[PDB]
C-alpha cells in the first residue's frame, strides 16, 4: 500500500535516527576510558582555548569538566572543573579550577568524607617548565567531601588559581590548547 509502506519506511528512519544517536554517545563513551586514569592523577587536555575562552565571556559555556578519573580500579570517582573566564571571586580576572567528587559505583566501601590530599596545577608547555599549582588537605566539615548523594558533590578549588593576564602572557598557552593536572594523594590510603 502506497500508505502502509509509508509507515514502515518511517518506523525505520525514526529508529535509524536513534542508532545514530546511540552510536553517537558510544563514540564519546570510548574517549572517556581511552583517557581515564586509575592512580589519582589526571591530565586534562583542553584544546581550542581562544574560542572556548571567548565562549566563557559571552557566557554561553562558562565551564567544562574533565574526564572522570579515579584513584584505584575501584576507588573514588572524581574529576575537575574549570572556568576559563573565572567564577565568583575571579570572574573576568582569573581562571578558576576545582576538584570534584562524583557518585562512584564503589563509594559504598570507601571512607567518607573524602580526606586525601589534592594538588591542582596548570602545566607549562614552555621550556622553562615552571608549572603552577596549589594543594590542600580537604577540610572534613564541608559538603564538598561528604559521601556523594547526587551525580557529583559540590565543587572546590581556588577561583583565583592564576591571573588570566599572567596566564595568557606566560609560556602555557600553546597551539591553542593547554594542560591542567590534578594530583590526589593515594599513599596514606591503603588499597585492596
Amino acid at each position: 500500500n502506497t500508505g502502509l509502506l509509508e509507515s514502515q519506511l518511517s518506523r525505520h528512519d525514526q529508529m535509524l535516527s536513534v542508532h545514530d544517536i546511540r552510536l553517537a554517545d558510544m563514540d564519546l563513551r570510548f574517549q572517556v576510558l581511552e583517557t581515564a586514569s586509575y592512580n589519582g592523577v589526571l591530565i586534562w587536555k583542553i584544546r581550542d582555548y581562544k574560542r572556548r575562552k571567548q565562549e566563557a565571556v559571552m557566557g554561553k559555556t562558562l565551564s567544562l569538566y574533565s574526564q572522570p578519573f579515579y584513584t584505584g580500579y575501584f576507588g573514588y570517582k572524581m574529576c575537575a572543573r574549570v572556568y576559563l573566564n573565572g567564577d565568583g571571586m575571579g570572574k573576568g580576572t582569573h581562571l578558576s579550577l576545582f576538584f570534584v567528587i562524583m557518585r562512584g559505583e564503589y563509594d559504598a566501601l570507601l571512607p567518607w568524607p573524602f580526606k586525601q590530599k589534592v594538588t591542582l596545577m596548570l602545566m607549562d608547555q614552555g621550556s622553562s617548565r615552571r608549572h603552577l599549582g596549589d594543594a590542600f588537605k580537604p577540610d572534613p566539615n564541608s559538603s564538598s567531601f561528604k559521601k556523594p548523594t547526587g551525580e557529583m558533590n559540590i565543587a572546590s578549588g581556588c577561583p583565583v588559581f592564576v591571573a588570566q593576564t599572567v596566564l595568557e602572557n606566560g609560556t602555557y598557552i600553546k597551539d591553542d590548547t593547554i594542560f591542567i593536572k590534578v594530583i590526589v594523594d593515594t599513599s596514606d590510603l591503603p588499597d585492596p
Binding site: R81, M89, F98, A155, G157, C158
Partner: peptide, 11 residues
C-alpha cells in the same frame, strides 16, 4: 594557602 573555597553553581 590551604583554606579551600567553592564556586557559583546549584541551579
Amino acid at each position: 594557602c590551604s583554606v579551600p573555597i567553592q564556586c557559583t553553581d546549584k541551579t
